[PDB]
Design a protein around this ligand. Structure first.
Ligand code: DCC
Lengths: 188, 189
C-alpha cells in the first residue's frame, strides 16, 4: 500500500538531511506519490516520523516480546534482543541513521510520542531482568531500572558510534561481545 | 567575560527554546549585548553551539585529568569520572538539557563536528582501561572501544533518563551503583 511506501521513502529522506530539514514534498517525490496523497495517510510531518518509529521500531519490539519467550535464560533472551536489533539496523543504512539520530527530539510532545513507542523496548529489558533475578541468574539486589539504563545505553552508544563511522564495520558481529560486557562487566 | 557571557546566555536560550529556535538575536538579548558583538566572537548559531560544547568539555577534561592522577585503580578512576559527570550536569539544569537534547543534532556535517569534541573524554576512558589492562585489573579479552562505548553509553543514558524525568531525582547519588554495574555486570555471583 501507499502507507508503507511513504514510510520507506521518509526513512530515505529523513536520513539524508535530518528530520528538521526534511520536507514532506521531498518525501512524496521520493515515494513517487502526489503531495496530497501523503495527507491521505498522514496528518503532518511529525505524524510521518512517529509512524516510522511505530512501524519500524514498534514492530521490532512486538517481535521481541514473542521470540524471547522461547529462550530459557535471561542471558539468551538478552542475546536475542541485541543480535536482532543490530541485525535490523545492519540491513538498512537509512533506518540506522533515523532510529538513532531522531530518537530523542527537542520538541516535548514529539519526544513523548517517540518515548512512548520506545517504552516497549525498555519494558522487555525490565522483564528479562526481573525474571532473571527470581530465577537466580541475575544479581540479587540489582536495581532493574538502572540495569536497564546500562543495557539500553550500551546498545544505543554501540550503534550510534557505528553510525558515526558510516556503518563500515560489522555491527552484528559485535553482539556477543556487547552481551558479555553487560553480563560480566570490566573487572577481571 | 564577553565570550563566556555569550556562551552562558546561549546555554539558557538553547535550553529554554530548543536549538532551532535559538537565533543570534535572542542570544544577544539574553546576554545583554548587541547582535554585532556575538559575531565579533562567533561565525553563526552553529559556531556558538559547537563552541559552547568545546568550552564546557574542555573545562571538564582539565578537571578530570587533575583529579584522576590521584586515584590508583581503574575502578577508582571510573568512580571519579561517573560522579564528576553526574555532578556537573546536576549542577546546571540548562546545560543538562543542552547536552542530552540540544547537542544531539542529526544533520551529519554538524554532528561530526560536535562528536570530535567528545573524543577527548573517550580518550580518558580508553587510558583508564589500558592502564587497567597492563595492571591486570581489567577482564582478559575485553575490547577497549566496546568497553568505552558501554561506559559512556551507560553514563549518558543514566543522565538522559533523569533529564526525561525533569531532573527530579538525585542523579549524583546513583554514581556508585552505576559504577558497580559497569564493574561486575548483571550476572549473579
Ligand atoms: C560539557 C559537559 C560534558 C558532559 C559529557 C558529554 C555530553 C555528550 C554530548 C552530546 C553529543 C551526543 O549525542 S553523544 C551520545 C551519542 N554518541 C555519539 O554520537 C558518539 C558516536 N561516536 C562517534 O561519533 C565517534 O566514536 C567519535 C567521533 C566520538 C570518535 O571517533 P574515533 O575517534 O574515530 O574513534 P572511533 O569512533 O572508535 O573510530 C575509530 C575506528 O574504529 C572503528 N570502530 C569504532 N568502534 C568500534 C567497535 N566497537 N568495534 C569495531 N570497530 C569500531 C571505527 O569504524 C573506525 O574505523 P576505521 O574508519 O579506521 O575503519
Amino acid at each position: 500500500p501507499k502507507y508503507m511506501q511513504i514510510i520507506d521513502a521518509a526513512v530515505e529522506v529523513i536520513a539524508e538531511n535530518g528530520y528538521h530539514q526534511s520536507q514532506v514534498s521531498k518525501i512524496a517525490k521520493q515515494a513517487g506519490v502526489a503531495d496530497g496523497t501523503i495527507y491521505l495517510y498522514f496528518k503532518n510531518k511529525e505524524d510521518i516520523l512517529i509512524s516510522l518509529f511505530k512501524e519500524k521500531m514498534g514492530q521490532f519490539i512486538e517481535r521481541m516480546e514473542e521470540d524471547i519467550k522461547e529462550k530459557a535464560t535471561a542471558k539468551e533472551k538478552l542475546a536475542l534482543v541485541i543480535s536482532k536489533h543490530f541485525s535490523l539496523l545492519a540491513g538498512d543504512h537509512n533506518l540506522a541513521i533515523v532510529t538513532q539520530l531522531e530518537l530523542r527530539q527537542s520538541n516535548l510532545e514529539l519526544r513523548q510520542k517517540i518515548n512512548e513507542i520506545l517504552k516497549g523496548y525498555l519494558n522487555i529489558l525490565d522483564g528479562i531482568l526481573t525474571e532473571g533475578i527470581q530465577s537466580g541468574e541475575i544479581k540479587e539486589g540489582l536495581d532493574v531500572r538502572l540495569a536497564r539504563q546500562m543495557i539500553f545505553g550500551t546498545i544505543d552508544e554501540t550503534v550510534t558510534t557505528w553510525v558515526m563511522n558510516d556503518q563500515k564495520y560489522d555491527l552484528v558481529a559485535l553482539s556477543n561481545s556487547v552481551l558479555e560486557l553487560l553480563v560480566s562487566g570490566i573487572h577481571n
